[PDB]
C-alpha cells in the first residue's frame, strides 16, 4: 500500500470543524478526523469506502 496510508491524519492549520477519514494503519481500518478546512494531506478521504479501497485489506 501507498506510503502515505502509513502517515498520521493532519487537520492542518485552519479552524473548519470538517469531518473526514483517514486510514489507521496500527489499528488496520479507516477512523474519522476532524479536518481544519486547508492544505489536505493524502491520508484524507470522505468515505470509508474511499479509505479502504486505497489503504486497506483485511
Do not use: H
Amino acid at each position: 500500500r501507498p506510503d502515505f496510508c502509513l502517515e498520521p491524519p493532519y487537520t492542518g492549520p485552519c479552524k473548519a470543524r470538517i469531518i473526514r477519514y483517514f486510514y489507521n494503519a496500527k489499528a488496520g481500518l479507516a477512523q474519522t478526523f476532524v479536518y481544519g478546512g486547508c492544505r489536505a494531506k493524502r491520508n484524507n478521504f470522505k468515505s470509508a469506502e474511499d479509505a479502504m479501497r486505497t489503504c486497506g485489506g483485511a
